[PDB]
Design a protein around this ligand. Structure first.
Ligand code: TZ1
Length: 287
């Protein structure tokens, strides 16, 4: 029932450096005696009705619940032609910022991966694709539980269809994307698994920038971060080239990543399949 009024939100601090756009930590103290929340300011000068249509769409995300998916709390308009999106505050933040500055063993990294899969399996079973699964978008709470964030690309998959058709050739996170996404503009549940493979790669490199997928992929092609084309990447992937085995990364775990990187969407493992395979692997490496 909670509706959020701009007159009871006191700004504490910016969040995420700049990597999530303009997100800030607020205190919500209405009665003046208060909960902590993150607020995303969203430019929405697109005509009043288009703006409402986006609110309706965002609002539907609130009907999702899973402990490894961030909780979107509400979407208010500032009619200043912008939308204010209120969500739970996830205090340790992004794995991309967290993993470099903390000692985290193989068992714990595998535990993160199983949590992500569990949140993604739920999402898939609710008939949604995420389209933006990367380590930057996986947040960590205080008990080191994963919460998947940034649903700014998420989409309901239409009844009777096994893919969503991406329109628009815009800013794409291409280095996390399956070839069917890159070439044909089709996004399947199986395409989110490809992105998982890349996220798994990320964790096991400890989100080391120099081993990062854009860095690595540009090197395997040859040319620099500026001459880069989707076409050049697609061809490399078809020829069967892949991101390399990360340092100290077990061969069964790498094979996992490679299974997520099968060219043919249909032969990739499902999240629901990946959960137990990751439970089993984590058991070998715990304690
Ligand atoms: O923007 C969105 N979704 C986000 N989902 N997660 C974000 S970032 C963040 C959240 C909570 N807590 C945080 C804590 C720290 Cl330290 C750093 C960042 C966060 S923005 C959108 C969702 C849908 C449309 S747009």
């Amino acid at each position: 029932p909670t509706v959020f009024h701009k007159r009871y939100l006191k700004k504490i601090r910016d969040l995420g450096e700049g990597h999530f756009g303009k997100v800030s930590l607020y205190c919500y103290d209405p009665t003046n005696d208060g909960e902590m929340v993150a607020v995303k300011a969203l430019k929405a000068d697109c005509g009043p009705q288009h703006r409402s249509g986006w609110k309706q769409e965002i609002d539907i995300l609130r009907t999702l619940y899973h402990e490894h998916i961030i909780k979107y709390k509400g979407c208010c308009e500032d009619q200043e032609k912008s939308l204010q999106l209120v969500m739970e505050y996830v205090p340790l933040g992004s794995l991309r910022d967290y993993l470099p500055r903390h000692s985290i063993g193989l068992a714990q990294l595998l535990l993160f991966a199983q949590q992500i899969c569990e949140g993604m399996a739920y999402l898939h079973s609710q008939h949604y694709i995420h389209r933006n699964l990367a380590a930057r978008n996986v947040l960590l709470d205080n008990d080191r539980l994963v919460k998947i964030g940034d649903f700014g690309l998420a989409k309901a998959v239409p009844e009777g269809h096994e893919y969503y058709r991406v329109r628009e050739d815009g800013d794409s996170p291409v280095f996390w994307y399956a070839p069917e996404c890159l070439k044909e503009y089709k996004f399947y549940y199986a395409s989110d698994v490809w992105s998982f493979g890349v996220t798994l790669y990320e964790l096991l490199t400890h989100c080391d920038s120099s081993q990062s997928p854009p860095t690595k992929f540009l090197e395997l092609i040859g040319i620099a971060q500026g001459q880069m084309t989707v076409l050049r990447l697609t061809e490399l992937l078809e020829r069967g080239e892949r991101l390399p085995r990360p340092d100290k990364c077990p061969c069964e775990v790498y094979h996992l990543m490679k299974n997520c990187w099968e060219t043919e969407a249909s032969f990739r493992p499902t999240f629901e399949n990946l959960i137990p395979i990751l439970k089993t692997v984590h058991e070998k490496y715990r304690h």
